[PDB]
Amino acid sequence: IMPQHDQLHRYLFENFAVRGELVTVSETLQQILENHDYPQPVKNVLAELLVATSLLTATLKFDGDITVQLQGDGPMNLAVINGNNNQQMRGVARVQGEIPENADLKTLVGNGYVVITITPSEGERYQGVVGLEGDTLAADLEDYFMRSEELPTRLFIRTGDVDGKPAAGGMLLQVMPAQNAQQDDFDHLATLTETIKTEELLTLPANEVLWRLYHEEEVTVYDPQDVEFKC
């Protein structure tokens, strides 16, 4: 009973009113990077977007589409993943200039934002525009969620190489809404998961990674879910 391939799982911390999710998108990635000749720095934000988008997605009670993009006046005007609630993802980047060998994100992009737009099959749409104050996409998103959302959320995104092939995964924690969850416990959990090793995350069976961190906790593991490339 053990294969190999991208997946995202959900879990809730019973006595803590905080849910979390771990995910790997290294395969669906190989697919999005292939065909282009993208500089390291770009293959990175994308791995970064990809994961981010994934996790956002898995957290929203919807059904339809969503695009997450990075806009601005960098050499890379554009970068965007597109995916739905069935975690089927694809994306492209948009290079138009000089790209500094070891490029930073503020450097990689303009003064742009991140746009999160959702278009659910049947109903109103949702726009989320977050500025790039913070220095990590993962950060800007947490912060967005602090401000424009008032829901504490932490993103843990690791990017790297497994078997020469680039590979990416990530983790999420976030206050369960209107259940009065004590910031504390969370900070602890966050403190706990910060320790996660890109290495572990990317090569180690999720169930184990979850154990290695949350074993001492009352966890409720929901059914997993695939993540995959689209057309």
Side-chain angles (χ1 to χ4, degrees):
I1 55 194
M2 48 132 286
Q4 248 283 81
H5 77 271
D6 288 9
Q7 249 186 155
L8 178 132
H9 348 38
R10 285 182 196 57
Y11 43 80
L12 167 50
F13 294 86
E14 285 302 331
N15 320 293
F16 269 140
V18 183
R19 42 173 303 202
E21 36 182 44
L22 158 159
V23 63
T24 26
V25 297
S26 318
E27 209 170 299
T28 295
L29 196 63
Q30 349 236 63
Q31 273 160 72
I32 291 171
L33 292 191
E34 103 181 12
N35 273 322
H36 319 92
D37 197 43
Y38 279 154
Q40 264 319 166
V42 192
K43 292 196 302 318
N44 289 293
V45 286
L46 277 172
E48 276 208 57
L49 262 205
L50 180 49
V51 163
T53 302
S54 209
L55 293 173
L56 284 342
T57 298
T59 42
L60 295 186
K61 270 249 169 138
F62 78 112
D63 199 285
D65 297 343
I66 174 180
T67 83
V68 149
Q69 44 216 301
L70 271 214
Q71 276 181 336
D73 45 48
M76 184 172 84
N77 44 301
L78 185 49
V80 58
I81 316 305
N82 300 265
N84 48 31
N85 81 290
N86 283 322
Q87 227 78 38
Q88 305 184 306
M89 306 271 118
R90 183 196 18 102
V92 338
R94 220 38 108 182
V95 201
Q96 57 166 185
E98 209 60 16
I99 272 178
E101 143 147 315
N102 286 174
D104 164 34
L105 207 221
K106 301 311 172 12
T107 315
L108 277 149
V109 172
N111 288 296
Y113 301 84
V114 216
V115 164
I116 299 173
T117 129
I118 312 166
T119 142
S121 57
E122 177 223 44
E124 63 202 89
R125 317 296 216 238
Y126 289 110
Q127 197 70 304
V129 180
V130 50
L132 333 166
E133 318 317 275
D135 46 21
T136 288
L137 158 67
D140 316 275
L141 280 170
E142 324 181 43
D143 155 280
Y144 171 82
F145 264 92
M146 212 21 121
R147 329 293 198 63
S148 213
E149 282 314 322
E150 320 186 67
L151 192 195
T153 303
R154 307 269 287 96
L155 302 184
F156 301 101
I157 319 177
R158 324 243 137 315
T159 64
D161 283 41
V162 178
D163 289 345
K165 303 181 199 297
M171 265 183 273
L172 179 164
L173 298 159
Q174 135 173 289
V175 177
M176 294 286 308
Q179 293 166 70
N180 187 69
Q182 289 315 274
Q183 189 61 172
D184 303 313
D185 331 352
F186 188 88
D187 323 309
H188 304 163
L189 273 168
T191 307
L192 234 167
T193 125
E194 257 144 35
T195 61
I196 174 65
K197 281 163 187 184
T198 65
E199 159 53 1
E200 309 183 278
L201 188 41
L202 303 162
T203 63
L204 277 178
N207 71 94
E208 138 125 38
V209 187
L210 289 186
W211 177 69
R212 289 195 179 195
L213 301 166
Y214 311 105
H215 57 354
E216 269 159 331
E217 323 287 354
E218 188 52 58
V219 165
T220 271
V221 171
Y222 293 136
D223 276 64
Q225 173 161 195
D226 274 293
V227 175
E228 32 199 34
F229 196 52
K230 189 169 230 274
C231 164

